[PDB]
Subunit: 68 residues, 6 copies
């Protein structure tokens, strides 16, 4: 289960875990593997479709909250 080995579906849970299920799609289409998450930057999220800041933040912080 290493954060870095999360298959695309592993990530999905996570988001669902943040109540951001509504993003499970794209995050899946863009083959967002475990590791990928760990480096998403505001722009990646913008390219990934996320726009409500409170969500980028929510996702972004859900990340530091991961590696760490």
């Amino acid at each position: 289960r290493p954060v870095h080995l999360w298959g695309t579906e592993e990530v999905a849970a996570w988001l669902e875990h943040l109540s951001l299920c509504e993003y499970k799609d794209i995050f899946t289409r863009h083959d967002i593997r475990g590791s990928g998450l760990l480096h998403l930057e505001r722009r990646d999220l913008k390219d990934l479709g996320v726009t409500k800041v409170g969500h980028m933040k929510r996702i972004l912080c859900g990340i530091k909250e991961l590696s760490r």
Copy 2:
């Protein structure tokens, strides 16, 4: 506790700063409690805030929240 401020809890805060004119976006962007705590100049720029005196007012209202 800020850490759990619903989107409406934040609203008050802004209104407490006399920045009510921003309660909209801050609400649309689902700016939860925690989110505030990490806004960076850019987030505010993306959030619509532009008058520096306001970005600062909001940003310091944050430093003046966690600490």
Copy 3:
């Protein structure tokens, strides 16, 4: 050494990342070794890559090449 990777050397790499589905363009665009080392989000977007998880996979495969 990457710095001299012919267009086919790069190909392997991609295939090493399981991104074989990109070996085409990367070859058409005469993506030599050095070129890789400087691809920027845009180059990848121009290069056809779009699934973020891939741009990242490629980009990090690069940081994970020079360093």
Copy 4:
């Protein structure tokens, strides 16, 4: 010979020097003087006809590799 004083033909060599002779034409038509090179941006190259990324890159890096 100052990079900034390269006449249009000076540039030409350079490209030929990168094995990008196939671009000597346009680069010449667009009166690409020495200095001009120094500021080409992805778009200039796209307007200049270059499309194979590996070439824009090759040219672009041939530039930092110049001024510097």
Copy 5:
């Protein structure tokens, strides 16, 4: 001061760049001083300039005017 360059003031400038062959359009389009200061790649493309080396020459002659 550029900021007030009449259409003919601009003309000299171009001629100073050895881009006299453009003094026409730049004059027709009533390219006043200030206008120059904001030309963007497109304006030049609309203005007729096409040889990149010239758009650049003009554009930098501008950066090299305000600053």
Copy 6:
């Protein structure tokens, strides 16, 4: 008088104020209200009839020079 509330005639002055009176017509026909001005883009101007760059620029800059 809020830039955004300029009636069609309010705009007119402005243009006349830029010595672009020769455009007061179209700008009036196209019911160019205050706010409208604030978002004109090169194309709007082209559709609006303005063609001498120095004028689009003049108008365009007369705008940033407004909101700001």
